[PDB]
Design a binder for this molecule. Structure first.
Ligand SMILES: [Ca+2]
Ligand SMILES: [Ca+2]
Lengths: 583, 583
């Protein structure tokens, strides 16, 4: 088979082991409208090998400025001046450039989102007067004797408040007053992050050149959607049994680490069932591979990373019934419940260490797997000199791309943008944590492209393309979810109601507006026949254990901010996208 | 000045009273990419006169097939076969053609919207078993003794039910069961009317060729927004004083006639203040005139026709307070209220005779003002012969366009599409009334173009253009308003609640689901200190005259269908616009 495939390979070099060099040349600059442009036009000559190297008759077809960009841009000692994006036009082109001008805007776009991120902390820390939510809940005279009900069935205490302080003394920097001033700003921010990037990418476009087979692709997927939902809870059933810093702070760190392992394990299966379902029927041509992964493989990650953070945010503390009745999981066990702090703090750590545990892993995986940095420097000293002439000889130990270019390093930032927007009600410093990360990620992704990897073919790509109907398809799901976090996951809207409708002399007993005395006034008692975090009629009502006015009031404040903070921020989506200067 | 302007006019004929003919000719077919095409290219030669004829040095520059299109398409005896749109390409082009293929689709698009329009009547009429809403309300033993409160202050009775039958026997064909089956279909219909027209117009595109000055433009406008709101009520104050078929049927006909006069009078002022505010600052070039009228002049009509139908639908029966307290109109009078039938029937006639009183006026104004039809036929007999050679001599008594082409005849249909969609919860036959109207309007607008008017310059226009961000900007406001009619204006959502939550043994006294006994169970009593149509706590409550569970429940069903029937029909906007065949 050595000579059987040899006669095929020699036929292709006619129409122009020791590695081959390449170099007529002007005659293929007209059929399509600098060394990167030199490596561009030879790939237009080379266009194909899609099936030759994948068969194995060839091994690696490959290309082969550098010095200055190790100093002002890719050095760890690179002081913050400009991020010269214009060089990445001449160095790496506009596949990689449209991601490295994405970040550098995104980094400066996360600047003002972090000063409004420091804003919920700056007067969150400098004040010392909380209304109730760190005053009553931590003075153990007004939030000490609040004897609650258990949640689980067996191995469960009776429970008591004043075990909730260390979570709910630092919850009023994620609940108290800046949270509706930055999550009203974050829905404004993503609807300004998009539309100012549209003004930016057009400016970037002006600076630069210009039913049966898909059924079982989705109907087999929903068995794997619920595989992600059952990923978090069974290893929720593990760690909370073997345990009971210490109360729930270290455990909320710990339990979301354990699922984050299984998140990265089921990540590998998603790399091996996307190919199992696309190789069967309708493989197609070159541009529907990436448009399959955009609609299946990111969508795999969207159910891996986010359909357990949709489990803490949307369907965790629902269906508490008549004897604290769960649904029984249409089986023989008991279903879970939530805690009277707002369920967010057990989301804001799962928000943290799925985000700031991916940015401390998926960059440091791209640091330690390339042999850790500064062996002796890579080739800077002859980068000015360019006379390293067995340099073609010194290759083929270096690592190539795995026929997907930015896609893996681009999905991991859309997952990050899917956490700095879709889940931001809590934790305003998720910009500042992403700020210093996008200080470093714009250095180490600059570092590995400049030094570590084989030089990519400078494929001119115009606009993000396929992830653009996701960045709209996140931002229209985010302003729902930023609303559904302050509605269904945060306890501010019940804190606005009591401040505006339950401390007025109708249904309340105070003269003017004050937030004094909130936690005993906002839950529902459950007889021995204790309070639990729901709003139902107390036992011994006309219609007991069905809802109050006050469930139905704050659900009609909840459904209102899902309506008003949609229709305002959906209209600032209409007003800013009508009234900005294009140039 | 006769010879002063004569020397200007003779200079322009150099570079080529008795009317002039026109006719080198191939040499201007290349600079831009059949008699209509003959009149096209000479206007490209003629391009300009924008300032010459408007000054007065000329009188009318003008152009000058016909026979066959009076027979199969424009005849009253034109049997329904095809509507040959392809002829309007060769006869009138694609300014007028993109409106006459708009209608012919729209007419067939209103076919299925009228069989689902007959659907709320077909089993609305063939059944004779109403649950309650025409049984209790018209058996005068269960809806006879329902003694209500007055609404106004002086010259007002105590009032009683069983005066509401003739409105509420024929209200269960606009409320009972088909209304959530066609208004769920109408939000589906407009989000299928758009997206199938997008597939149609592309098919039509394949068949055919291819801060200070605007501040006081809007801040003076809001004084005229409330001028429209005060247009309806003062002549509401007139007619209801001089009165009291006869009970309220003839009056709901009458009062909406009187405002419809003032609607057409304030229509004339809007034609004379659009020019008053655009001639002052930044007049501009030729294509921002129509984009001024799209954003001011239609917007004038959108407040003329619709900000009194937004007064019956959104802010008519709100702010009923503690002694039935209105707001007092921050003045010294008393503000109004609504009636316990759902406020829709006093909207569905204002829906009718602003729609079916514009389609019986604005077409019949274009019939009787051109001298009523068939004087003797116009020029059909020589249309085959074409030898009427003083035909240029016989013109200049005929009427021209007033420098706006389709715009007036195109605004009046967008106003119609703004009633067959934005206001459709009630009255399913608003397709069938618009069906036989769009049988006739596609004949008489075909008739006046073919016979009555001077032939328009066949200006090739590609897509509707400026009214396309209105047809999206209606359909995103319609699925709000179709929701806000069943929420804020119709009494079905309170009829689903009692059927599902107030006839169950919690808060109700019946075994299984039945709608028996609804009107005494759904209003709130008001002491002499009678029921009124609101849901407040009865006098002698813990917190009296503030709301019930049941206000807050049905407002949380109201805000839910504003949320769910948005997010479903806003996602069928995402699913049909992802999964239809383009070709
Ligand atoms: Ca990376
Ligand atoms: Ca007309």
């Amino acid at each position: 088979t050595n000579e059987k495939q040899k006669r095929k390979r020699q036929a292709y070099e006619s129409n122009l082991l020791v590695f081959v060099k390449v170099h007529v040349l002007c005659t293929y600059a007209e059929i399509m409208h600098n060394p990167a442009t030199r490596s561009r036009i030879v790939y237009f000559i080379l266009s194909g090998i899609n099936r030759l190297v994948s068969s194995g008759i060839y091994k690696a077809a490959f290309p082969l400025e550098r010095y200055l960009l190790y100093r002002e841009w890719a050095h760890p000692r690179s002081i913050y001046k400009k991020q010269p994006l214009d060089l990445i036009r001449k160095y790496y082109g506009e596949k990689i450039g449209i991601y490295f001008a994405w970040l550098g805007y995104y980094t400066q776009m996360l600047l003002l989102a972090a000063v409004v991120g420091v804003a919920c902390f700056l007067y969150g820390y400098l004040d010392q007067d909380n209304c109730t939510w760190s005053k009553e809940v931590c003075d153990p005279d007004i939030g000490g004797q609040i004897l609650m009900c258990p949640q689980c069935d067996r191995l469960c205490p009776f429970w008591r408040l004043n075990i909730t302080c260390e979570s709910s003394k630092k919850l009023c920097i994620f609940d108290s007053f800046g949270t509706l001033i930055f999550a009203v700003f974050m829905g404004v921010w993503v609807t300004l992050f998009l539309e100012f990037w549209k003004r930016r990418q057009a400016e970037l476009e002006y600076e630069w050149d210009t039913v049966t087979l898909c059924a079982s692709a989705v109907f087999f997927w929903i068995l794997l959607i619920i595989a992600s939902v059952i990923g978090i809870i069974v290893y929720r059933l593990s760690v909370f049994i073997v345990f009971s810093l210490t109360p729930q702070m270290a455990t909320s760190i710990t339990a979301s680490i354990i699922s984050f392992i299984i998140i990265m394990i089921l990540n590998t299966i998603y790399e091996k069932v996307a190919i199992m379902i696309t190789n069967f029927e309708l493989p197609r041509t070159q541009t529907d591979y990436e448009n399959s992964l955009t609609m299946k493989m990111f969508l795999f990650q969207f159910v891996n990373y986010y359909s357990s953070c949709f489990y803490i945010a949307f369907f965790k503390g629902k269906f508490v019934g008549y004897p604290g009745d769960p649904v029984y999981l249409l089986g023989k066990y008991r279903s879970e419940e939530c805690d009277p702090g707002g369920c967010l703090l057990e989301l804001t750590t799962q928000l943290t260490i799925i985000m700031g545990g991916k940015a401390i892993w998926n960059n440091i995986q791209e640091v330690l797997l390339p042999w850790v940095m500064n062996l002796i420097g890579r080739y800077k000293r002859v980068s000015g000199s360019e006379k390293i002439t067995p340099r073609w000889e010194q290759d083929y130990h270096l690592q190539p791309m795995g026929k997907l270019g930015l896609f893996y390093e681009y999905l991991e930032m859309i997952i990050q943008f899917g956490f700095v927007t879709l889940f931001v009600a809590s934790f305003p410093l998720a910009p500042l944590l992403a700020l210093v990360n996008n200080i470093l990620e714009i250095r180490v992704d600059a570092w590995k492209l400049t030094t570590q990897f084989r030089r990519m073919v400078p494929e001119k790509a115009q606009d993000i393309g396929a992830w653009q109907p996701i960045m709209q398809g996140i931002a229209i799901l985010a302003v729902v979810t930023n609303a559904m976090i302050i509605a269904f996951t945060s306890d501010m809207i019940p804190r606005l109601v009591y401040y505006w409708s339950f401390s007025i002399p109708p249904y309340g007993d105070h003269t003017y507006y004050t937030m004094d005395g909130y936690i005993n006034n906002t839950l529902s008692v459950f007889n021995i026949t204790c309070r639990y975090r729901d709003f139902r009629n107390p036992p011994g009502h006309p219609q007991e254990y069905k809802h109050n006015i006050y469930y139905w009031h704050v659900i009609a404040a909840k459904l209102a901010f899902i309506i008003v903070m949609e229709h305002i921020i959906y209209s600032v989506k209409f007003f800013i996208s009508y009234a900005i200067p294009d140039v």
